[PDB]
Swiss-Prot record, chain A:
The keyword Nucleus does not apply. GO terms for biological process: endosomal lumen acidification; Golgi lumen acidification; proton transmembrane transport; vacuolar acidification. GO terms for cellular component: fungal-type vacuole membrane; Golgi membrane; membrane raft; proton-transporting V-type ATPase complex; vacuolar proton-transporting V-type ATPase complex; vacuolar proton-transporting V-type ATPase, V1 domain. It comes from Saccharomyces cerevisiae (strain ATCC 204508 / S288c). The keyword Ribosomal protein does not apply. The gene is VMA4. Residues 12-31 are annotated as: Interaction with VMA10. One of its GO terms (molecular function) is proton-transporting ATPase activity, rotational mechanism. The chain holds residues 8 to 59 of 233 of the full protein. Transmembrane segments: none annotated. This is V-type proton ATPase subunit E. Residues 8-38 form a coiled coil.
From Swiss-Prot, chain B:
Belongs to the V-ATPase C subunit family. One of its GO terms (molecular function) is proton-transporting ATPase activity, rotational mechanism. Its main location: membrane. Changing residue 255 to A: Is rapidly degraded and disrupts stable ATPase assembly. It is found in: Vacuole membrane. It comes from Saccharomyces cerevisiae (strain ATCC 204508 / S288c) (Baker's yeast). Transmembrane segments: none annotated. It is a peripheral membrane protein. Subunit of the V1 complex of vacuolar(H+)-ATPase (V-ATPase), a multisubunit enzyme composed of a peripheral complex (V1) that hydrolyzes ATP and a membrane integral complex (V0) that translocates protons. V-ATPase is responsible for acidifying and maintaining the pH of intracellular compartments. Subunit C is necessary for the assembly of the catalytic sector of the enzyme and is likely to have a specific function in its catalytic activity. Reversibly leaves the enzyme after glucose depletion, causing the catalytic subcomplex V1 to detach from the V0 section. This is V-type proton ATPase subunit C. Present with 21114 molecules/cell in log phase SD medium.
UniProtKB/Swiss-Prot annotation, chain C:
This is V-type proton ATPase subunit a, Golgi isoform. Subunit of the V0 complex of vacuolar(H+)-ATPase (V-ATPase), a multisubunit enzyme composed of a peripheral complex (V1) that hydrolyzes ATP and a membrane integral complex (V0) that translocates protons. V-ATPase is responsible for acidifying and maintaining the pH of intracellular compartments. Is present only in Golgi- and endosome-residing V-ATPase complexes; enzymes containing this subunit have a 4-fold lower ratio of proton transport to ATP hydrolysis than complexes containing the vacuolar isoform and do not dissociate V1 and V0 in response to glucose depletion. Belongs to the V-ATPase 116 kDa subunit family. Present with 1084 molecules/cell in log phase SD medium. It comes from the Eukaryota. Glycosylated. The chain holds residues 249 to 297 of 890 of the full protein. V-ATPase is a heteromultimeric enzyme composed of a peripheral catalytic V1 complex (components A to H) attached to an integral membrane V0 proton pore complex (components: a, c, c', c'', d, e, f and VOA1). It is found in: Endosome membrane; Golgi apparatus membrane. It comes from Saccharomyces cerevisiae (strain ATCC 204508 / S288c).
Amino acid sequence: LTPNQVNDELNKMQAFIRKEAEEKAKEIQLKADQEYEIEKTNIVRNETNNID
Amino acid sequence: MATALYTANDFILISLPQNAQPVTAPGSKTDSWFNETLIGGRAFVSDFKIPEFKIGSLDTLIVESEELSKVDNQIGASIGKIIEILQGLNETSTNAYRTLPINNMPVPEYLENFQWQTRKFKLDKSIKDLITLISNESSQLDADVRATYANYNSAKTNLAAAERKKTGDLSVRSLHDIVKPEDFVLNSEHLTTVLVAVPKSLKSDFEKSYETLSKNVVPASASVIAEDAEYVLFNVHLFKKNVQEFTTAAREKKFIPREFNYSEELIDQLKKEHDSAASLEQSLRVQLVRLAKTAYVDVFINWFHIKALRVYVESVLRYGLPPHFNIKIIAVPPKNLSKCKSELIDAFGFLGGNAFMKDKKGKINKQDTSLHQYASLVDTEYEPFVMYIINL
Amino acid sequence: VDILNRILWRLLRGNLIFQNFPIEVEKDCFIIFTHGETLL
């Protein structure tokens, strides 16, 4: 190929890979907060009714 | 080049990175080049700047392009059928509905003011739901327009059968609009009336024979109540028992009896059938012409929603970053498409490939090969930069 | 080799660096560089 083509195709390539990692990583951590909050409430809620 | 041309303008939708510069005019501006240089300045440029959307991951991205191609082609086809249903109805004859308003704004004027429509399609929603919503709307609308045009064609067929029954050709026809209390007697049961469908030659032959066909045939009843080109339609009154002898005797002479009595319910129901059939075709046709026109606009807004989406996502796949692109809709005057397409390829082609590039022109549609179809779901011939060709 | 090159070029719109090197029935090697995911 041409030098210009190959560097343009390398700069595109890693941009997708970093981007795929950011986008997946956001979903994991966005769900990890919903999970934190829920599970903390559940553990209390079960037990506060027992103390009652 | 064309695919359903009337007098509609043809459009090329292009998108580029914001670092791109033409090589055909070095150091020139992209926006200026499109209006000024491009096919001798007879190029009319309109805005068509598509917003950012929620782009998936890398694996999901392949699957997003595959579906945009398919859905695009469906909507494009389906609209082609709607135009046809109109063309046949004579609601599109010289020109109509390819330049006609699209919510009170003509088709070329509408594309320039088209930038994304926030009618129900949101940018706080996912890409996936945008493809599913738009495509569902497009399919569903086509199916209702198709169901009414089928029903209308059936309805014409019933009416046509009915008019001929009410007068035309005798072979199934019994008259019901030319009744009279004395040319058609049945009030007790002694007398009845038999009608005889007689060829024209045979008209004299009937006037002579009518009395002899059976015994107890009423005098001077034989008169032509109705007449058509092939046949003359007679009434004769006679006694009910004798109707069997009469009919058989009629068929030897080489007449054809048509049996109709003057029962009240008979006369009324045949008459009704003519009327009910005209009223069904009538109501339907008015709703059906209205329904297609209303469908036409909706599937138009929806076709462009996919293309805008399609082009955007593709741009992301081919150039990479920036996610901010310089996007235009260029109105080409009819038959300058091939010359326009080539000029764009020379300038901008280097960006998407310095070896993956060849000269090309126009748009040819085929099922001979899959090459030259410019799509990301089937193998085609790779374009050197993102360019999609719209034929109206 | 050519029909696999054309099918992968029509599947991945661009987005590949396809080579071939003849192995020395006759056969051939290939390198693709599928730049990304979800089509692997």
